[PDB]
Design a protein around this ligand. Sequence first.
Ligand SMILES: [Cl-]
Ligand SMILES: [Cl-]
Ligand SMILES: [Cl-]
Length: 96
Amino acid sequence: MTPIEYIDRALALVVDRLARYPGYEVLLSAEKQLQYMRSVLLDRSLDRSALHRLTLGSIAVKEFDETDPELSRALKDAYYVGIRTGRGLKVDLPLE
Ligand SMILES: [Cl-]
Ligand SMILES: [Cl-]
Ligand SMILES: [Cl-]
C-alpha cells in the first residue's frame, strides 16, 4: 500500500458518510484535510508546513471511535501515512 492509497480510502469513506450527513462540519473538515495531504504527496512545490495544523487523528478519536469505527480507523491510517516523511518510505526494485 502507498500513502496515497490510504488517503484515497479515507476520502471514499468520508464521501460515503457525507451522503448520509451532508451538512456535518466534522466530515467536511476531514475531507479538506485529506485533500490537502493528498496534494502534498502529489506536488513537492506545495508547502508541507501546514501538516502540523491537521487534526485528523483527533477528529477520529473524538467524533468516530464510538459512532463509526471503520471511518475512525481509516482516518487514523491516513493521518499517520500523511505525516510520515518522504525519506523513510520503502521501495521495491524490479526483479527483486
Ligand atoms: Cl482505530
Ligand atoms: Cl517520519
Ligand atoms: Cl514504512
